Structure 1
Amino acid sequence: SYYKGQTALHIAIERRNMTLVTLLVENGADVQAAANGDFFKKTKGRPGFYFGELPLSLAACTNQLAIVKFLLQNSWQPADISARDSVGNTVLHALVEVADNTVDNTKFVTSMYNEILILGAKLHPTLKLEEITNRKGLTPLALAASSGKIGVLAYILQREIHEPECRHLSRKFTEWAYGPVHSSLYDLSCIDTCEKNSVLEVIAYSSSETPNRHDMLLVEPLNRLLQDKWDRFVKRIFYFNFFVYCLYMIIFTAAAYYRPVEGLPPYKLKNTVGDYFRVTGEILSVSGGVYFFFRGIQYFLQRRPSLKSLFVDSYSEILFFVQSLFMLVSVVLYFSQRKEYVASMVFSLAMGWTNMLYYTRGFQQMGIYAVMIEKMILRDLCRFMFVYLVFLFGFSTAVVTLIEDGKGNSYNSLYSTCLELFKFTIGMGDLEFTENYDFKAVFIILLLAYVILTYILLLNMLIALMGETVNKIAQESKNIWKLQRAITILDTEKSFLKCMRKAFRSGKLLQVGFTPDGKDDYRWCFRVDEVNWTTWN
C-alpha cells in the first residue's frame, strides 16, 4: 500500500521544521525508514522526485542543514551514512541525481556535498563513502559524469580543503606558491582509463542524450590531461594511421584504375609484373576493406551506440563501415562471374576518398571545418533537399504532362525532364530544350516559376541559413571537435591493451600528505602551474 513506506518523520522533514522532527525522533523513532514507493522513484515521466529512501537522504537532497546535523550527531540510532538504497543510490548519489545546471541548485548540492562528506569523514574516517557504487556500478563521480552534472564534476575535480586533518579528502593538493606562481596537483584516481567505468570513458561513450557532454570536457583538469596525452603519445600514432590510410587509398585507386576491361571476371594470373602488382593492389584493398568491416562491427558491439540518432555521433564510423561493406559486396560479385562489381568498387573508392576528412580532427582548424560540414549536412542541406525535391518533382511532372511528342524527341520520360530541371538548378538549364509541347506560354510560365522558386529563392535562402547556422554553431563545433579528439585518444590508447600499457599512463605517483591512519597518500597527481596577481595569500 502507498501509505506504508512513508513515516511521520518523512512528512515532518518535508515541512522542514527542526523542532517537530526532533520531537518526533526523541522517543527513539526509527531512522532506517525506506520510502520504497513508486511516487519516490526516479522516473521523470511520472510526478514526484526521487531523493533517497532514507530520511537522511531526503534531508540531504533538501537544504535542511540542521536536520542532517542533528541526525548524524544524535545520541541514539545514528543512521549509517553508507546505505545502498533500492536503486543503490547512496545519499551522495541522490545528491548528484537532484543536482541541476541551475546556479543555486549547484550551490546547495555543492556546499551540502562538502559538509556531509566531512561529517562522514568525522564519523568513519576509514570509510570509503565516495567509492560506494549503486546497482549500475557507478560512483557519484561517474554518475554525475553520465547524467551531465557539470557543477558537481567541477567541484569534485577541484575539491580543496584547508583543514590539515581532513584535507586528505581532497582532490587538488596545492603544492606551493612562490609569489603569484603556484602549482596545482590533481588526483586522477578514476579520471584515467584505469578503472571499470572512468570519467573520461563515460563522457566519451555517453550518447548525445546527456546534456553538455562536450562542454564538461572544458574543465581545466580534463582538458589539460587530454592535450597532454595527445601531445605526448597519440599525435604520432594518429599521423601514422593517417599516412597508412593515405597509402591504402592510393593503392585502391591505382588498382581499380587499371582494372582489366576484357573478359568476364575473374581474370587470369599473367607472368608479367604488371598483373602481379595489380593483384597485390586488389588484395591489399580487400584486406583493408575487411579490416574496416571488422572494426565497425567491433565498434557496434563494444559501444552499442544509440539507435535513436546514430547519424549525429557515429557518422564517420558509419561511413567507414559502408565503404567496407561496398568493397566486400564487390569482392562477392567479382568471384560470381558478374561484371556489376565495378559499381560497388567505384562507390567504395569515392567513399574512401571522401572519408579522408575523418583525419582532419587531429588539426585544430580543419576539425572545426569538418564539424561544420557535417552539421550543415544534417541540419541545413537535408531540409533544402526535401523542399527542392518536392518542387522539382512537381514541376517536372507538370512539364512531362505538357509534352506530347506526337510528331530532342524522347523527352517524355520523367527522368529526362527532372534532369533538365536539375541542370536549371546548377545553372546549365536551357529554357527551350524542346519544342514538342502544344502551348509555349504554359511551358515558359512553368519553367520561369521553377527558376524563380528554386534558383532565385531556395539557393539564396540556403546561403542565408548557412550563414545563420555558422554564426550560431561556431562554438558548438569547437567543442564537438574537442570531444572527437578525446574519443580518438581513448580508442588509440585502448588499442594497445595487449601491446603495452606502462608507458601509456598519465600523471606521476606522488606522496604529499597523510591519512588520519598515519600513512601516506600515494596518488597519480598531474601538475598545473597557475599565476594570479590578486589572490596574493
Structure 2
Amino acid sequence: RRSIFEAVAQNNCQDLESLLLFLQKSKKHLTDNEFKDPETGKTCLLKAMLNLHDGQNTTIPLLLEIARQTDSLKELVNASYTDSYYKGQTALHIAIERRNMALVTLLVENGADVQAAAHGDFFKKTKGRPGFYFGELPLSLAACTNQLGIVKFLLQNSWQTADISARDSVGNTVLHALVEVADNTADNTKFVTSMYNEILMLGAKLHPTLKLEELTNKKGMTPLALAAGTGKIGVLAYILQREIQEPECRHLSRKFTEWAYGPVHSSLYDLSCIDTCEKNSVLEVIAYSSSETPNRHDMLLVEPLNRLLQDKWDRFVKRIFYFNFLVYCLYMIIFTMAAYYRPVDGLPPFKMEKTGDYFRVTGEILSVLGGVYFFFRGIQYFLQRRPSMKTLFVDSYSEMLFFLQSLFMLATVVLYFSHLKEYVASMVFSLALGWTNMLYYTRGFQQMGIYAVMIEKMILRDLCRFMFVYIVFLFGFSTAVVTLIEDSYNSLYSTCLELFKFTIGMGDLEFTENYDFKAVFIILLLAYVILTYILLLNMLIALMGETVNKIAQESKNIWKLQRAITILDTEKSFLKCMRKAFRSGKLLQVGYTPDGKDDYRWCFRVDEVNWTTWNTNVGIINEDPGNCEG
C-alpha cells in the first residue's frame, strides 16, 4: 500500500505505531507480502534504508520491533528485490554502502543473510546502464567501499558469519572482486593494495589452512592472474612485492629477505605463478595478453619480472635465440641464393642437369621445408594463442609476416608445379618479407630492438596517416594532369608514377610537352610539389620527431615485451629438447608454514643495497643465522 511506504519515507514515527496496532490484529502473512511494491520486492525495510538520512530513519528499528512480536522476521530482513535488475540486493547491501556501521550490526543480529548473491544487471559488466560490480557478496561491498572496520566486523559478528571464500555466480572471490574493481589510479591503488593485507591477515587469522590467493573463478583466473590480465599494474606490484612483516601472516609474504649485512640485502621474491603454474602465469597472462589490456607494456617493469626475464635471457634464451637467428639468416641465404640462380630458360618444373642444379634444388627443398615450418608455426600460434578478429591484424604483426612469408613461399610451390612463371611473383615477395623479417630478431638487442619498435610505430602512426593523405593528393593531381594531357604520358600510371618521383627527388617538371595549357600544368605540379615534397614529407619528419619524443620509454617497454614473448615461446618449444623452462629460481626455505612445516618456495634472488635504511629493522630476515648463503 502506498500510504504505508509514505509514512516510511517521511520517518513518521506515530503512523507506523498506528499501523503497528493495525496489522497485529490481522495475520500479516500474505498481507505485507502483497503490500510490497509490485515486480520489485520493495518491502518496508528495504525502502526505509534508501530514504534514510544522516545515519537514521527511526523506522528501521521500529519495523524490526514489529517483526519480532509478529513472527516471520526472517522473511523480512532477507527480502531481496524480484526484478532481474536489482536482484538479490538485501537490506544488508544498502546498510554497508550508506556508511551506517551501527545499522548493519542490527541486521546480522536479526537473522539477515550475509551470503546474499546480488547478480541483477546493475552488478554485472555492461557499459549500457553502467553498473558498479563489487563482487556479489556484502563482504566484498565493504571491501570495495573503504569500509575496513566493517569487513573486520563481518568476520567477528555473532552466530552467523560471512564466508571469506566469496564464490559467486561468476566465481570471483573477494580478492577477485578487488582486482575487478581497481582502476590503476593512485587513490584506488593505494586503497586496494592495502585491503588485501587485512583480508589476508584475517584469512590467516580467522580461517588458516586456506591461502586465499590460489582460489579461482568460473573462468579460472587467480586474483594474481586477474590483475595480470585485466591490466592492474599497481595491484600486481603489491601482490608480487608483498612483504608482510609479522608472525602468523608471514608465509603470505611474497618478497622475503634472505640476508642483510649492512645496506646490502638479498631480496628473495617468489616465482609461484609468475612462471610454470598449471594455468595463467603472470608472464603468460601479460605476454599472451590480447591488445587493449591497459598498462600491458608497463607490467614487466614490475620487479621481479624485469630481472627474471633478463635472467632467463642471459641464461637460457639468448643462446637459442641467436641460434634461431642464424638458422633464419642461412635460411634466407639458402633461399636467396636458390632464387638468384633460378632457371630463366623455360617453364617449370626444372631439371637437375648440371652439378650446381643439384645444390640448387637442395636449397629449394630446404627453402620449402622452412615455408611449411613458419606456416605450421603460424598456425599453432592461432591454436595455442587463440586471437580475436581485432588481434589478428593488431598486436601480432610478426606471426602474420612470417606466416605471410610462407603463403607466398607455398604458392611458389603451387605455381612451380602448376606450370607457370608466376612462382617468381611469390618467390620474390617471400624474399622481401624474409629479409624484412630479419627485423624481428632485433628484439634480442636493446638498441636495435627499440629501433625496430620505433619502426613499427612510424609505419602505423606516421606513414599510415601520411601515405593515405599522400595518395589523395597524388591521385588527385595525377588525374588532374592526365586529364590535361592529350595524345606517352596520357595514362594514370605513367602520371602517378611520374608524380611519385617528386617524392624521391626525381621529378621532371617538363615530363610532358603533350599538354594544352602550360600554366594549368605548372600551377598543378607546383601545387603538388609544395603540398607533398616541401610540406608533407617534411611535415612527416616533424611528426616522426614528435613521435620519437613520445615513444622513447614506451618503445623500450614494448621491446621488453617483445623479448618476453620470445622468452616464453622458447620455453614452450624446448619443453623436451634440453629440459623444461629451467624454472629460473632456486627452491629455498623462506620460513615456516602456519601449520608448522617448511615452505620451500621457488624464489628469485635480488641483491639490493640502500644507503638510507641505516637501522635495518630485522623483521623477516631468514638466514640471519647465516650471513650470505654460505
* Structure 2 length-normalised TM: 0.82
Q: CA RMSD in A?
A: 1.7
SS at match of 1:68: helix
CA distance, structure 1, for counterparts of residue 452 and residue 200 of structure 2: 44
Larger mean Cα displacement after TM superposition, 215-224 or 500-509: 500-509
Match of 1:258 among 341, 345, 368: 341
SS at match of 2:605: coil
CA distance, structure 1, for counterparts of residue 138 and residue 204 of structure 2: 20
- Cα gap change, 1:99/1:3 in structure 2, threshold over 3 Å: closer, same or farther? closer
8 Å contact kept, 2:571–2:581: no
Q: Deviations over 1:218-274 (max 9, x none)?
A: 0120111110000001100011111111111001111111111112111122153x1
8 Å contact kept, 2:574–2:580: no
Alignment match, 2:91: 8
8 Å contact kept, 2:233–2:299: yes
- Cα gap change, 1:2/1:201 in structure 2, threshold over 3 Å: closer, same or farther? closer
8 Å contact kept, 1:437–1:443: yes
Q: Deviation at 1:309?
A: 4.5
Larger mean Cα displacement after TM superposition, 124-133 or 470-479: 124-133
SS at match of 2:390: coil
8 Å contact kept, 2:572–2:581: no
8 Å contact kept, 2:415–2:421: yes
Q: Deviation at 1:305?
A: 2.1
- Cα gap change, 1:461/1:527 in structure 2, threshold over 3 Å: closer, same or farther? same
CA distance, structure 2, for counterparts of residue 383 and residue 512 of structure 1: 55
CA distance, structure 2, for counterparts of residue 454 and residue 280 of structure 1: 48
8 Å contact kept, 2:117–2:137: yes
Alignment match, 2:516: 438
8 Å contact kept, 1:63–1:108: yes
8 Å contact kept, 1:161–1:167: yes
Where structure 1 has 5 or more consecutive residues not aligned to the other structure, the ranges are none
1:346 equivalenced with 2:428 (yes/no): yes
CA distance, structure 1, for counterparts of residue 342 and residue 357 of structure 2: 10
Larger mean Cα displacement after TM superposition, 19-28 or 112-121: 19-28
In the TM superposition, structure 1's runs of 4+ consecutive aligned residues that sit over 6 Å from their partners are: none
Alignment match, 1:375: 457
CA distance, structure 1, for counterparts of residue 552 and residue 402 of structure 2: 26
CA distance, structure 1, for counterparts of residue 187 and residue 518 of structure 2: 71
SS at match of 1:211: coil
Q: Deviation at 1:342?
A: 1.1
Q: Deviation at 1:488?
A: 0.2
Larger mean Cα displacement after TM superposition, 352-361 or 23-32: 23-32
Q: Deviation at 1:66?
A: 1.8
Q: Deviation at 1:417?
A: 1.1
CA distance, structure 1, for counterparts of residue 94 and residue 581 of structure 2: 56
Larger mean Cα displacement after TM superposition, 386-395 or 4-13: 4-13
8 Å contact kept, 1:193–1:200: no
8 Å contact kept, 1:59–1:68: yes
CA distance, structure 1, for counterparts of residue 554 and residue 162 of structure 2: 46
SS at match of 1:346: helix
Higher helix share: 1
SS at match of 1:4: coil
CA distance, structure 2, for counterparts of residue 36 and residue 248 of structure 1: 57
Q: Deviations over 1:305-343 (max 9, x none)?
A: 232244442112211111111010011011011111111
Q: Deviation at 1:390?
A: 0.6
Q: Deviation at 1:175?
A: 2.0
CA distance, structure 1, for counterparts of residue 469 and residue 406 of structure 2: 32
- Cα gap change, 1:390/1:503 in structure 2, threshold over 3 Å: closer, same or farther? closer
Larger mean Cα displacement after TM superposition, 422-431 or 304-313: 304-313
Q: Deviations over 1:145-178 (max 9, x none)?
A: 1111111111111111221222112111212211
Q: Deviation at 1:60?
A: 1.2
Alignment match, 2:378: 296
8 Å contact kept, 1:39–1:48: yes
Match of 1:416 among 494, 504, 519: 494
8 Å contact kept, 1:264–1:338: yes
Q: Percent identical across equivalent pairs?
A: 94
Q: Deviation at 1:464?
A: 0.6
Q: Deviations over 1:447-496 (max 9, x none)?
A: 11111111111111111111011111111111000000000000011101
CA distance, structure 1, for counterparts of residue 308 and residue 87 of structure 2: 50
Q: Deviation at 1:22?
A: 0.7
1:402 equivalenced with 2:484 (yes/no): yes
Q: Deviation at 1:36?
A: 2.0
Matches within 5 A, 1:143-154: 143-154=226-237
Alignment match, 2:445: 363
Larger mean Cα displacement after TM superposition, 500-509 or 348-357: 500-509
Q: Deviations over 1:36-78 (max 9, x none)?
A: 2111113244322110221111111111112111110012111
SS at match of 2:265: strand
- Cα gap change, 1:502/1:411 in structure 2, threshold over 3 Å: closer, same or farther? closer
Larger mean Cα displacement after TM superposition, 339-348 or 27-36: 27-36
Rg: which structure is higher?
Answer: 2
8 Å contact kept, 2:509–2:525: yes
SS at match of 2:191: helix
Q: Deviation at 1:82?
A: 0.9
- Cα gap change, 1:68/1:194 in structure 2, threshold over 3 Å: closer, same or farther? closer
8 Å contact kept, 2:270–2:601: yes
8 Å contact kept, 2:134–2:144: yes
- Cα gap change, 1:429/1:350 in structure 2, threshold over 3 Å: closer, same or farther? same
- Cα gap change, 1:2/1:466 in structure 2, threshold over 3 Å: closer, same or farther? closer
8 Å contact kept, 1:190–1:199: yes
- Cα gap change, 1:353/1:502 in structure 2, threshold over 3 Å: closer, same or farther? closer
CA distance, structure 2, for counterparts of residue 117 and residue 82 of structure 1: 12
8 Å contact kept, 2:245–2:253: no
CA distance, structure 1, for counterparts of residue 315 and residue 410 of structure 2: 37
8 Å contact kept, 1:28–1:76: no
8 Å contact kept, 2:173–2:215: yes
Q: Deviation at 1:276?
A: 0.6
Q: Deviations over 1:67-123 (max 9, x none)?
A: 111110012111111131111000111011111211111121111211011111111
